[PDB]
Amino acid sequence: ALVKEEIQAKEYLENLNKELAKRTNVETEAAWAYGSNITDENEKKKNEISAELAKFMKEVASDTTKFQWRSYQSEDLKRQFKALTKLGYAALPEDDYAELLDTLSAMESNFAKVKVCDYKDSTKCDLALDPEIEEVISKSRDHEELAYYWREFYDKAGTAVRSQFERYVELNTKAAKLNNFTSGAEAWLDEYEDDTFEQQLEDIFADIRPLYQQIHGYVRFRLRKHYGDAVVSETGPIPMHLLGNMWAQQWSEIADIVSPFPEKPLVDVSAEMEKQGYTPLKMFQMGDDFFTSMNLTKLPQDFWDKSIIEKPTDGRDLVCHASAWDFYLTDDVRIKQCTRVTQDQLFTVHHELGHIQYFLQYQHQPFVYRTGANPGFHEAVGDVLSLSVSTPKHLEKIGLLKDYVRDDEARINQLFLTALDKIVFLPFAFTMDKYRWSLFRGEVDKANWNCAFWKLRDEYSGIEPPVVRSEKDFDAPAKYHISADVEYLRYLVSFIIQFQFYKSACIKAGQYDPDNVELPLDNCDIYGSAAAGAAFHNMLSMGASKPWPDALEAFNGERIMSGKAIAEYFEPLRVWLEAENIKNNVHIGWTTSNKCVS
Ligand SMILES: *[C@@H]1O[C@H](CO)[C@@H](O[C@@H]2O[C@H](CO)[C@@H](O[C@@H]3O[C@H](CO[C@H]4O[C@H](CO)[C@@H](O)[C@H](O)[C@@H]4O)[C@@H](O)[C@H](O[C@H]4O[C@H](CO[C@@H]5O[C@H](CO)[C@@H](O)[C@H](O)[C@@H]5O)[C@@H](O)[C@H](O)[C@@H]4O)[C@@H]3O)[C@H](O)[C@H]2NC(C)=O)[C@H](O)[C@H]1NC(C)=O
Ligand SMILES: [Zn+2]
């Protein structure tokens, strides 16, 4: 009888979820030890325990067939069983899974161990991406120096792992097909529980794309005035090494040379943070303060005891790209961040604490539900707070922004600064997964893999390498997430929905009213708002217990992912920028790049 079996199934799930949490704890501890301290021994430990968990997952997926779960009355039970059928990489045969783990750790460790020689001192070769190289890329205005560090990094972080990346693509594809997905693209897209998700994103992107073109055109115009026409052409793609970021993903670091009104204030609180004696500990304490001020959960003692919030001063290798960790017990959550005292890093702290808050909010859920409504939701949480932290309103409250006059021109400066991070990022994020999807789907021949990457970067972002590349180079893995096998569409989703969350949180806080000039969206601070916090609690506590539109509905009553909010935020900028580009006869669009030889 199905009635009797469904009762037994509920008991089966309750026990299994608890077992899965406990087994995942062990894997997470080994992964933590490796990420904090990269050694051959720790790699072996991490990968052996993962292989053990994978074997158990196989048994679980096999055991689900003993239950007639598709026939059950409970949508909740059926959802849990469905989650258990999805094996991912664990679907691979024992030997193939072990090889993939070896391949993945080889790529991540390569990225983490990259060291380059100093541009001025060829005998000093201990410059790592974080913080040495990134500091130069963000601060230097010497185009030849920038080009040097670009080439050195991409050669070492990208090209060096071509063979490993090829095997990764093969095994990822094999895994996807064993789960009966067409490719790893479909496997990744399954996390969004919507068969029209790609088209939805194409539609939203197409709406925002014209604004991006205007920003691109204006930045190119301003860069020409700084570097001269020998470095930057009017009609070509922007040389990417000039954009203040190794991957040209966000351009805020060059705001001082491209700001609409250079004689008016531009928010850069890094210097005032240092003057006031800010430390990584203080920054995390301030993040904790922001969450608690919204009536959300305080960081547990385990977080303070076990987190790594500064780059270790011994000679050891580690993954410095910031991460948050859920150990699937009670209150055992951690962050690993090589944090520096800068404005950008203050946002990163809040970003990572957003993940931690999500962990704490759903820790009461059964194991399979202890994850985000979709991957984009998890990435969005901290960014909503970062948007308010970034406002002149908030920065003045914490004494980091002094003698600031918020006139029309200063507002345009701030909107443009935000756009250099939020709008600029959209085509970048889309191309990261458009690229990997095309490889996963077998749409690009191996002989064309590198120029296929740069073709997308050209088509969507209108940027190009500083030097001519070819199929002898392999540049994609020079981006952390590509070497680390981290799906990237989550960030495109995040950057869209975070404005939906921000707008609604601001309205709930009484901080935004479209008909009130005194309450603009771009100066909303949700600090101290219990009303905004309540919306977060209602959504985050759900975890993955319901499809993501139900989680969005819990927040603000909406069920649709929409670009309306992000466009609303930047509308005052759009109006000004379109007019400024016409006034200055600014060329919009770009010719096809010549920087990748087929
Ligand atoms: C991805 O898709 C794959 C298909 O492309 C899929 O692989 C299939 O999984 C099926 C299991 O659901 C499996 O079906 C079984 O087939 C057995 C015989 O197959 C052999 O010969 C085939 C050639 O004809 C070969 O290709 C195979 O390699 C095999 O050598 C059958 O013996 C078996 O049957 C038994 O089970 C059914 C199922 O019963 C169900 O559950 C209850 C039980 O209480 C029933 O009441 C209910 O009605 C329901 O039917 C019983 O009905 C029956 O009495 C037997 O006990 C079964 O049909 C199939 O072989 C396999 N491969 C192929 C090529 O089809 C993967 O599972 C998919 N992967 C994922 C992750 O989803
Ligand atoms: Zn994140």
What's the resolution in A?
1.9
CB 105 within 8 A of CB 47: yes
- Per the entry, the structure determination technique was X-ray
For 406-462, where are the alpha helices, taking DSSP H only? 408-422, 425-440, 449-456
- Both tokens of 521, joined, read 């969206």
Residue 405 neighbours by CB distance under 10 Å: 9
d(CA 408, CA 182): 52
Distance 174 CA to ligand 1 centre (A): 20
- The three-point CA angle 352-362-531 to 5° equals 75
Coil, strand, or helix at residue 469? strand
Helix axes 343-362, 375-389, angle to 10 degrees: 130
Eight-class DSSP state of 228:
-
Best residue among 69, 85, 180, 190 to mutate for probing ligand 1's pocket (most ligand atoms within 8 Å of CB) is 180
Breaks (C-N over 2.5 A) in the chain follow: none
Coil, strand, or helix at residue 231? coil
Backbone angles phi and psi of 335, in degrees to 5:
-120, 145
d(CA 202, CA 455): 18
Instruction: Return the closest-CA partner of residue 384 out of 596, 532, 554.
Output: 532
Looking from the CA of residue 65, the nearest atom of ligand 1 is 41
d(CA 70, CA 6): 11
> Which residues make beta-bridge pairs with 334?
325
For 179-246, where are the alpha helices, taking DSSP H only? 184-189, 197-227
CA 368 to chain centre: 22
Question: Would the CB of 67 count as within 6 Å of ligand 1?
Answer: no
Coil, strand, or helix at residue 308? strand
Q: Calculate the dihedral angle through the C-alpha atoms of 454, 457, 458, 461, rounding to the nearest 10 degrees.
A: -170
**How many Cα atoms sit within 13 Å of 371 on the Cβ side?**
13
Sign of the dihedral defined by the CA atoms of residues 499, 494, 189, 78, in that order: negative
Question: Would the CB of 252 count as within 6 Å of ligand 1?
Answer: no
